[PDB]
Amino acid sequence: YDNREIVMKYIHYKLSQRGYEWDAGSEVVHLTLRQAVDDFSRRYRRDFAEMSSQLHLTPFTARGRFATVVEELFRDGVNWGRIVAFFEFGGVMCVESVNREMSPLVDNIALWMTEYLNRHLHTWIQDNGGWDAFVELYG
Ligand SMILES: CC1(C)CCC(CN2CCN(c3ccc(C(=O)NS(=O)(=O)c4ccc(NCC5CCOCC5)c([N+](=O)[O-])c4)c(Oc4cnc5[nH]ccc5c4)c3)CC2)=C(c2ccc(Cl)cc2)C1
Ligand SMILES: [Cl-]
């Protein structure tokens, strides 16, 4: 499995489902993630809605805001649900970057998500069965 491909295909899906074609953006993990993320957004739509309105996103503060939320999301540890929420939050910032006329941020956000998966979540994901376990548990 490829963390970068999973991030890239999700963002392209999230932005396309908001009417935007993201330029820079096995098959079962993408399908399972997109369904799990949609399920999470449905169940926590108010949190999704209020997260966009409270971001105060500028190119100067974008990374500090991304890192602060991701830090808090995994402060108490990692599970598959928080990983799904991690993807959904990354989608918020990408849609919000496009809405606020800051589409270049999508490529930076894609990189920050890939880095976090490669360097901080990778060991937990591998030790808890990898994405194979994720698709088995929820796909
Ligand atoms: C500053 C902040 C950090 C503060 C906090 C918040 C918001 N928080 C984030 C964490 N959150 C969590 C965390 C864990 C869990 C969980 O139970 N975990 S679990 O037991 O491992 C698991 C259980 C079920 C599925 N799947 C169901 C399947 C059913 C059949 O269809 C396919 C899917 C999965 N799974 O991996 O799919 C995994 C969870 O509950 C659910 C419930 N239903 C879910 N459906 C999909 C995921 C999911 C999680 C919700 C609560 C909300 C902030 C915030 C704000 C906006 C955005 Cl945008 C983001 C974050 C900001
Ligand atoms: Cl990386």
Residue numbers in the entry: 9 to 33, 90 to 203
Sentences from the paper on this structure:
BCL-2 is the founding member of the pro-survival class of proteins that includes BCL-XL, BCL-W, A1/BFL-1 and MCL-1. They exert their pro-survival function by binding and restraining related members of a family of pro-apoptotic proteins—the sensors of cellular stress (the BH3-only proteins) and the effectors of apoptosis (BAX and BAK). Four or more hydrophobic amino acids on successive helical turns within the BH3 motif engage complementary pockets (P1 through P4) in this surface groove of pro-survival proteins. Venetoclax competes with pro-apoptotic BH3 motifs for BCL-2 binding, releasing pro-apoptotic proteins and allowing apoptosis in cells primed for death.
